[PDB]
Structure formats: C-alpha cells, structure tokens
C-alpha cells in the first residue's frame, strides 16, 4: 500500500547471558513511554505495546518485544510520485485521437512508455527489493506500460493502414462492408460520403483508431479499480 502503508516494526529485548532460570524479565508498563518524544514528520506513531514472551516448550527462554506500529504521512509521495504518475498515465489514450497525418504518433506513445518505465524503476529503487508482494502503484504502472506497448503496436498497424492507396493495395469487399458501413455506425461516426479510394483507406484507419479509443477509455477508466483500492 505504498505510499499509504503502515509498518509493524518490532524490537525484541533479551539477556544474552542469563536464561529464565537465572533472571526473569518483567514489564514496568504495558506500553512504551512517549513522555519525551519528538514527532517524526514523515512517520506517525500509532501504538507501542510491549509484551513479555515465554516459550512453553523451552522454559529457559524469556524476552520482551515492543511492537512499533507506525503510519506514513503520505503527502510527500502523493505529491512527488502519484500525481506525476497519474499525469503520465492520462496521456496513454491520446495516441488514438491523434490524426495519422500529423506523423507524431510514435513520438507520443514512445515518450509515454519511456516515462512509465522510468517511474517504475524509481519506485523499484524506493521500496525494499523483496519478492513477497508488489506495490499497487508498481502493479498499476506495470499494467499501464503493457497497455502502452499494445497501443504502440496498434498505432503501427493503423499507420500502415492509413498510408494505403489504390495503386498499391486493393480493399476487399468485406473490408468495405465492415469498416465503412457497419463499424462507423456503432461508434456514431456516419461517414459523410458526399461523393476517392485513397480517402477510403484514410477513413478505415480512422475507424480503427476510434474503436481502440473506446477500448482504451473503458479499460483505463476501469483501471481505477486497480488504483482506487490503494487509498
């Protein structure tokens, strides 16, 4: 749950010379004292209980363990890691609304992928390198990177489709009946068709982008399920 995580750090005290048959450890109080405590600023103290543990199987073991339950104050990282990451992620969908004639789809999607990977590696440098659980922020960034790679592949496909002319490719009848008649209707496009083959190729490439813009908006919006669960 980084950066909204809560840590449970313990301090175990023992006498490394005498066992329970020689000295018995007792707790002066059930909690640690905060009478002269200086507030941290990054970490919020929640509870500092102390417990005296015996081993029913050993009878020579005694210790006192203090559980330090601390809660991270999350504004620093919510400002320096989450907002920049959400800002980067919001650009993952623009590539499908960018006209293919601008010749900048690759720049946009490649830059988005670069930024997401950089943020993922930074998060991998802030957290312990343990393989027990993955931060939800890291998982969400990982999912977004996979989506952006998929969008790069789709943009390459759409650019190939767009730069098609009747002198190099022939459009099959099924392509016509699907992409110029049926699919545009579902997406509320309604080709003006005021009147030539080259523009048909351009429109087909535009229909494919509009279709994937829908898919990347529902999935991206549904991506809040993988993000809103952290806070």
């Amino acid at each position, epitope marked *: 749950h980084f950066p909204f995580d809560q840590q*449970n750090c313990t301090m175990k005290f023992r006498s490394w010379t005498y066992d329970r048959t020689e000295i018995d450890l007792v707790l002066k*109080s*059930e*909690v*640690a*004292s*905060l*009478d002269d*405590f200086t*507030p941290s600023g990054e970490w*919020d*103290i*929640v*509870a*500092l*209980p102390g417990r005296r543990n015996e081993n029913p199987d050993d009878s020579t073991y005694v210790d006192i363990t203090y559980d330090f*339950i601390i809660r991270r104050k999350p504004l620093f990282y919510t400002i320096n890691l989450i907002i920049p990451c959400v800002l980067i992620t919001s650009l993952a969908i623009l590539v499908f609304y960018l006209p293919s004639d601008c010749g900048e789809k690759m720049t946009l999607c490649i830059s988005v992928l670069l930024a997401l990977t950089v943020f993922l590696l930074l998060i991998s440098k802030i957290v312990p390198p343990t393989s027990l659980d993955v931060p939800l922020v890291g998982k969400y960034l990982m999912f977004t990177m996979v989506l952006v790679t998929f969008s790069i592949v789709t943009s390459v496909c759409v650019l190939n489709v767009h730069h098609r002319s009747p002198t190099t490719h022939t459009m099959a009848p099924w392509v016509k009946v699907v992409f110029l008649e049926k699919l545009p209707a579902l997406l509320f496009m309604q080709q003006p068709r005021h009147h030539s083959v080259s523009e048909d190729w351009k429109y087909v490439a535009m229909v494919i982008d509009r279709l994937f813009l829908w898919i990347f908006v529902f999935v991206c919006v549904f991506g809040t399920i993988g993000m809103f669960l952290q806070p």
Partner: antibody
Amino acid sequence: VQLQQSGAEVMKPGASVKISCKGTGYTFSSYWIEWVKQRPGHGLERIGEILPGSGSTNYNEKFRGKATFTADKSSKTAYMQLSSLTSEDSAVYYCARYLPYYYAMDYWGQGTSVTVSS
Amino acid sequence: DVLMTQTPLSLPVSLGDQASISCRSSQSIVHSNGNTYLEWYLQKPGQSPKLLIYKVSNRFSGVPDRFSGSGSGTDFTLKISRVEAEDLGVYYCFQGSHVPWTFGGGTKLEIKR
C-alpha cells in the same frame, strides 16, 4: 486507572467551550484519548482522537473544524475546544482511553454535560 | 468513514430468552494482520459505556460468559445465551479497523411481558 472529566458547563450560543479529561495511573502519553458525543436523544458519535505523546489528531467528517484537541503532558490532561456552539451541540461528552489494534476503550470518563442556551 | 448499521432498532426479549444483535459495515473492515477489529459496548441508563467484546470474538475480562460474538468480512452478530435484569441497556458495535473509527447505530434492549 481513572479518567476525570471537568464539570458541567452552560454556554451561550456562538461561544466556545473547553472541556478537559485528566488521566492518571497509567502512561498518559502512550494512549490515545477518544472523545465521544452523546446527544440526549440517542446515539454515540465519535468526535476524534488525540495521542498526547505526539500531536497527532483525527476527526470525524461531521466534526472537522467544529472541535479542536490539545493535550498537556506536564499535567496529564487533554482538552477539546468546541467553537460556534449551536443548540445541537448540547449533549454529554465522554473521554476514553484507546490503543488501536491492541486495547479497546476499557476506561471511560464520568461524562461532561454541555448545554447551549441563551 | 465506514458506515455501521445495527438491526433491530429495538429488541424486546423476555427474561431467559436468546438475544441476537446484528451489525453490518458499509465496507469490509478486515485488516492485514489476520484480524478484523470489532468491539461491542453496553451502556446502562445514566452511565458511561462498558466494554464487552473486542476483536470480534475475544471476551473482555470480568464479563459474563453468556456473551459471544461472531462474524466475517462485513457481517457480525452478538449473542446472549440468557437475558437478565442487569443486561438491559443499549448495545453498540465499534469498528477499530479503518481510520476514522465509527460507532454503530445502537440497539436498545427490552424485556417483553
């Protein structure tokens, strides 16, 4: 262990009152102090909490801004200050000792009654 | 804030009868430690509340064994094997899992005759 609350209070509308909860017989600075409001009608509403050792404080959404917690360590006392007392604020307020995830609200103050009237 | 609801608002049950109290949460109040923190408080008229059960099932020291608790992610119930005169009062469910911590609606208890 004992939580001692201040006496009953009567205040005019729009004023501010400050009630206190004094804890003794335990590590006062290591236990959260929970403040609970009980209108004469019905219901228990938790106002918020303060850890005297530090300054950390939480408030329920309904009471954000209405109440403010301050704690004194030299004298084992915790204070809640209510601002802009209306007629709804008239109720009985309790102070309780709480350690999250380990010990429940096992000790409660006697209860302080606040009445808002002109 | 997690919203906690109690049913019934009033529970009339004569002496010696089984008493069932149900509390529900607007969200799951489970916690990573393997425990979900739920507590039950009883208030007599003109008195400060008293702790009865904590951590769903664990029973506070010095309380009659008739009281028992049980529940899951978002549904919990309190059981009283036998009802007595001292048992009269109001019962609240308290969740100690998600900040801020909220009380239940309260369920008054009465004896029918």
